Design a protein around this ligand. Structure first.
Ligand SMILES: NC(=O)C1=CN([C@@H]2O[C@H](COP(=O)(O)OP(=O)(O)OC[C@H]3O[C@@H](n4cnc5c(N)ncnc54)[C@H](O)[C@@H]3O)[C@@H](O)[C@H]2O)C=CC1
Ligand SMILES: NC(=O)C1=CN([C@@H]2O[C@H](COP(=O)(O)OP(=O)(O)OC[C@H]3O[C@@H](n4cnc5c(N)ncnc54)[C@H](O)[C@@H]3O)[C@@H](O)[C@H]2O)C=CC1
Ligand SMILES: NC(=O)C1=CN([C@@H]2O[C@H](COP(=O)(O)OP(=O)(O)OC[C@H]3O[C@@H](n4cnc5c(N)ncnc54)[C@H](O)[C@@H]3O)[C@@H](O)[C@H]2O)C=CC1
Ligand SMILES: NC(=O)C1=CN([C@@H]2O[C@H](COP(=O)(O)OP(=O)(O)OC[C@H]3O[C@@H](n4cnc5c(N)ncnc54)[C@H](O)[C@@H]3O)[C@@H](O)[C@H]2O)C=CC1
Ligand SMILES: NS(=O)(=O)c1ccc(Cc2c(-c3cccc(-c4ccccc4)c3)nn(-c3nc(C(=O)O)cs3)c2CC2CC2)cc1
Ligand SMILES: NS(=O)(=O)c1ccc(Cc2c(-c3cccc(-c4ccccc4)c3)nn(-c3nc(C(=O)O)cs3)c2CC2CC2)cc1
Ligand SMILES: NS(=O)(=O)c1ccc(Cc2c(-c3cccc(-c4ccccc4)c3)nn(-c3nc(C(=O)O)cs3)c2CC2CC2)cc1
Ligand SMILES: NS(=O)(=O)c1ccc(Cc2c(-c3cccc(-c4ccccc4)c3)nn(-c3nc(C(=O)O)cs3)c2CC2CC2)cc1
Lengths: 331, 331, 331, 331
């Protein structure tokens, strides 16, 4: 008899069957920040990692495993084969190609489409009932791509979208007011990053409309230049990329926040990218961030924000530019 | 009036003072993993980061700040000047040089000594009552270096030591037994890494001694080769380094574990590197890991583990080796 | 030698000092729910309990101590003597008399004033720098009582106020909308309980004003009867009291929420009872709930909510009523 | 269109299907302490409460619901009908009769059996795949009763047993040593309370056997009287009952600890009561606490503690007395 059998009497030859499993595909800085954030929030009973770089993948898995004593996620697995991902409730895509020096980031779209053409069918093959959370950029385009390839209904395909943009907005708003971002409310909608739309009518503390207090809010003649808050939502992201080479910690925390609502069926409202055709005169299949109710079935509902004519037109124009690029992608 | 003053009536304008502050020096992978782990465990109400690479430092700080919505640590600061670190309760040193190709371990440690000669006096100036937690390698030697440079009493100078090695031991033990590492008990003592000592007499589940169940435990005669568990404690560290280039997540969690005991005054027992002169025939100023009680004053007590003659001789040999290196360091 | 000295070598024998200490005075259902909530949220490194019923006090203390394995608050103490409370950062007052059958509300408050005349001077003696959080009812009147007895500056005397009423409001709002209360925003201000004021202009999801969507919101004309949401804020409290005899769990969580902002210096915004003289035509020393910024110094700022004429008149009428009662209290 | 439909566009008519549901039956002080502890540890996505006292049940449910803002458990339900319990992963039984003044607690056994004859078939009817965790006293007898009535395999019927007794043991051990109970290891096995067995051979800090350090450990001639540690495991429970009337907080934390391992599939080792026939010469169907591995299938394995002849005989005698009473219960 082995020492294990000397010490331990077994009652059950059990079905190792995962109940609250999450997969992260792509273990770059973003994927691993999502992983550590999910692990430290105790959201999964099993975590699977997938990548194409085999040594890096195994090393990251082992590094996490060596911390198991300090975690409450008892099973961490990895592999290039998607059988390690079977029966995931939630599959997070952070995979992408490396932009080469000098080239334009427009070259990355089709490269990442080709990556998704390999990833997404394998995800579906092993977790046909999962929710897909897309993080890879350009995220609104790639969420549409993931939706198309997966065949999933739109409630189960979620783009991380403007959840991070809105977190940055509330951070910068809190800095100006001396109030924790949790008590500073404001919504950035539409496309992630450059073209996002700040909804000035919704910016408030304790239910007090800042736009009503300060009618110049969000205009160019605002002597306090609150529009700079949204400008810095975009430019601070480019600044972090310039300063440290990439961003990782805030998106990792953002993604774990989305995973928390999904895994725990919270029905909190998050600005994530969803298939928005049938709103705002948008007549094309495109994904844009609006406030969505997130839970165990993905996006079950969304909030219809009342928009100014200018805000609505910006969303329509974003839909047009998304549709224009999408019709030139090769599936 | 400003929008802020329209919205908010100020009662107090008093110089806010830091209450439960941690500093991390060095924002490579290890420092940032310590940072994110401390942040996600809510161990500090203020986090300061220091490095000599100014752009990387600012970018990491901003990245964390952008996740403020998702955290409960309201102040995150950074700078190359140590005034940002003033009044830390705990200062975590992860700074070090990059060992160059063909650079000897002896030349490398001296370069880290020269780094500590700049860091530690500056830390002491602005937080003279802090606890020092030394992570940089060689960690046991550099804990001695920090102790000698700081002038601190020995209770307030702690090497992360074998807390990580023991976590790896318990992970590997749990893998063999099918039990969570939290319930698998076993202690790795002495030097971090290469020369660490597994204390087979303490390995147990539910208080059942594995050595008494299986007297070959820890010997080469053991048909089940349980010595491989300790061999993998050392080799798996080198394997992660080979596979992903460095280690970060497990040491980050290990450091947060130590920080939790110190910041919350828990008086849990951890194997950390402490001044061991007076034990095991060691008469030199050497730091090695033994089980220590950790709380608000650093190391207040240590456990006197009953060691075999062979185990004691390995600690004494380690102390001899460490002192031989330390007495040739240029301070 | 003793077993303890065989096992443990002591380095430091120094008077341990309290670092992040909370006291709860009064260990009825409300005090103990505050206690367990603070313990399970890891808000304090020392918890002191005080009451005049000595056996009940010791039994509650011991019961918590027996769960120490499952907590991270290493010191739990109690006594009728206030030396056990020395150096608390936050002192939570839940003490009060049992209203007798046929005893008037005016006779009852005077009995709680006489209780506060013994409690508050003793608290101040041993923690002169603490923040006072008053929970006992009538909470707004007794916050004034504690302020006048303590001599504390107004920033350090806080009534739990309408944080609980607003939580009930958001729960009931979330039930109607199918959204988690965390994402349902609405503020109940003024007096706790009976005479509280719902601020319909601030009720929103994702920054979308419900009053602007549904102009009948808050009126008797409203076919959807949203005023019933605020009516249930008051009536559901009385219903719980009728059904289980008292309320405890929600106020315990509400108090822990306030304690979290104070202990961690979060500067989140909470509707708590604060000195309101100078607003809304109120010239008397009266405490009512408005949104306040809570941190390490108590209430540092308050938000000036834009109120309708009717809302402002209700706050002014409340202040008139409270002052009429307070000026007849015997100190 | 209602305000809800004006604000929110619905994507999914969804199956409200519970994924991580827990039920507590009996909402006395113990049941509600288990409930609040489970809620504050975020273990369930749905909590159901059952009792026969209808007003108390509704009041406790409402009090919890009013705290929803401060929790992450989005659905709290209650009822006397067990359809509210459908599809629970884990069902915790804390129901029991009130001992009348003067009568012997032996009269309670059959009264609580009769209670279980109503409860357990209804639990099975609506959650035929759940794990049953029995807390009601006498817990080892009633765990056997629940096992018999339910028809479940023994891995899915768990008595809270000596998990609490062992937590008290480690608390008292920590008090003597000045070490947090988390670092003080020691096991109390067998029957809950009066007849429990302290396993002195397993008592250790950092793997250091206290019995080997101090061979009088656990004997009557021990000049330091460490046997008093186990005496106080029993007597401190009776003391709390005398002082406050009952115990609740420590058992609530104990039960949440067991629920954590079960719901998160941790495979930690806990001393819980399990059907032990086939060990220690025990030839009868009886439940006694031994160290069990707990996870998503309940008790999957148990540790075979090496026992002295006296320890083994105490467990055999306990089995005999359990069997003697059980054969006089009426099912
Ligand atoms: N939506 C948002 O708010 C944010 C999104 N991101 C995006 O996250 C993505 C990843 O960011 P980083 O980690 O910094 O990039 P990275 O390039 O370092 O990591 C990408 C990983 O994907 C792996 N990969 C490539 N092809 C793969 C394939 N078929 N299958 C599996 N794995 C594959 C790669 O080997 C790599 O390890 C980027 O697209 C980035 O723009 C980053 C921050 C904010
Ligand atoms: N004790 C343990 O268990 C473990 C310790 N380590 C050690 O952690 C240390 C850091 O590891 P990595 O982050 O991977 O290396 P890294 O080289 O990427 O980071 C070191 C950082 O220290 C900075 N630095 C150099 N001189 C400085 C000075 N005067 N002041 C402030 N910052 C300075 C550097 O700019 C660098 O950003 C290494 O020595 C490593 O061996 C790594 C894992 C396990
Ligand atoms: N502000 C809010 O939102 C809410 C406040 N409360 C109030 O909390 C207070 C306590 O509620 P319960 O625990 O249910 O009542 P309780 O009567 O059971 O507990 C009050 C405790 O105060 C003790 N006491 C009396 N005089 C004392 C003195 N000098 N010093 C120390 N302790 C003393 C009493 O022995 C008692 O144990 C009540 O006034 C209640 O109305 C209750 C829930 C909501
Ligand atoms: N195993 C352990 O370590 C510990 C176990 N306990 C035991 O917990 C049990 C409950 O303790 P308390 O809450 O203080 O007692 P309690 O008598 O106040 O609560 C029992 C509840 O069960 C309800 N009840 C009675 N019959 C019922 C039925 N058919 N169906 C549903 N509910 C029913 C009762 O109405 C009552 O609300 C007791 O047996 C106690 O000995 C208490 C502490 C330690
Ligand atoms: N609506 S969309 O058309 O899908 C969409 C449009 C635009 C972006 C910008 C972008 C990209 C990115 C990378 C590679 C290719 C393209 C690309 C290619 C073709 C056409 C359009 C865009 C975009 N990366 N990126 C990052 N953001 C972070 C962060 O930390 O926020 C870190 S990199 C950001 C947000 C910027 C930092 C604030 C993204 C998406
Ligand atoms: N007792 S000592 O003399 O202080 C002491 C002795 C030996 C070590 C080894 C070591 C080093 C290291 C790097 C550079 C120089 C020296 C050095 C310089 C002079 C003299 C001796 C050694 C040591 N780095 N390193 C790491 N470990 C990890 C991990 O993840 O564990 C990641 S890098 C480890 C632990 C090994 C991987 C498991 C460490 C300390
Ligand atoms: N603005 S004020 O003048 O301070 C102020 C005015 C009125 C109240 C009502 C009240 C009392 C209470 C008890 C005893 C005496 C007095 C009293 C004495 C003198 C003068 C006026 C009132 C008030 N108790 N009480 C509770 N609420 C809960 C809960 O769970 O909410 C549980 S008991 C509530 C809130 C009600 C249930 C919703 C409270 C405060
Ligand atoms: N092995 S057994 O035969 O099942 C078994 C045997 C003995 C007990 C004792 C007991 C009871 C209890 C209540 C009612 C009836 C019987 C009873 C009836 C017939 C025959 C035997 C016992 C026992 N209640 N009780 C509590 N403990 C706590 C705590 O906080 O620990 C709070 S009440 C305790 C533990 C004591 C405080 C430390 C329990 C079980």
């Amino acid at each position: 008899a082995t020492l294990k059998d000397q010490l331990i009497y077994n009652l059950l030859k059990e079905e190792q069957t995962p109940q609250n499993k999450i997969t992260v595909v792509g273990v770059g800085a973003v994927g691993m920040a999502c992983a550590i954030s999910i692990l430290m929030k105790d959201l999964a009973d099993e975590l699977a990692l997938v990548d194409v770089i085999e040594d890096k993948l195994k090393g990251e898995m082992m590094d996490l495993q060596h911390g198991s004593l300090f975690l409450r996620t008892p099973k961490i697995v990895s592999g290039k084969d998607y059988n390690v991902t079977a029966n995931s409730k939630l599959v997070i895509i952070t995979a992408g190609a490396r932009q080469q020096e000098g080239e334009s980031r427009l070259n990355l779209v089709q490269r990442n489409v080709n990556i998704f053409k390999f990833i997404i069918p394998n995800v579906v093959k092993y977790s046909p009932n999962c929710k897909l959370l897309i993080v890879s950029n350009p995220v609104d385009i790639l969420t549409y791509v993931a939706w198309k390839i997966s065949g999933f209904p739109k409630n189960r395909v979620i783009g991380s979208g403007c959840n991070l943009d809105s977190a940055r907005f509330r951070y910068l708003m809190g800095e100006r007011l001396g109030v924790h971002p949790l008590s500073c409310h404001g919504w950035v909608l539409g496309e992630h990053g450059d073209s996002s739309v700040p909804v000035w009518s919704g910016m408030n503390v304790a239910g007090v409309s800042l736009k009503t207090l300060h009618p110049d809010l969000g205009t160019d003649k605002d002597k306090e230049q609150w529009k700079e808050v949204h400008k810095q939502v975009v430019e601070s992201a480019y600044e972090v990329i310039k300063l440290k080479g990439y961003t990782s910690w805030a998106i990792g925390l953002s993604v774990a926040d989305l995973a928390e609502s999904i895994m725990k069926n919270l029905r909190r409202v998050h600005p994530v990218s969803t298939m928005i055709k049938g709103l705002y005169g948008i007549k094309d299949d495109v994904f844009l961030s609006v406030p969505c109710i997130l839970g165990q079935n993905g996006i079950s509902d969304l909030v219809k924000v009342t928009l100014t004519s200018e805000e609505e037109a910006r969303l329509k124009k974003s839909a047009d530019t998304l549709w224009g690029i999408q019709k030139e992608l090769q599936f």
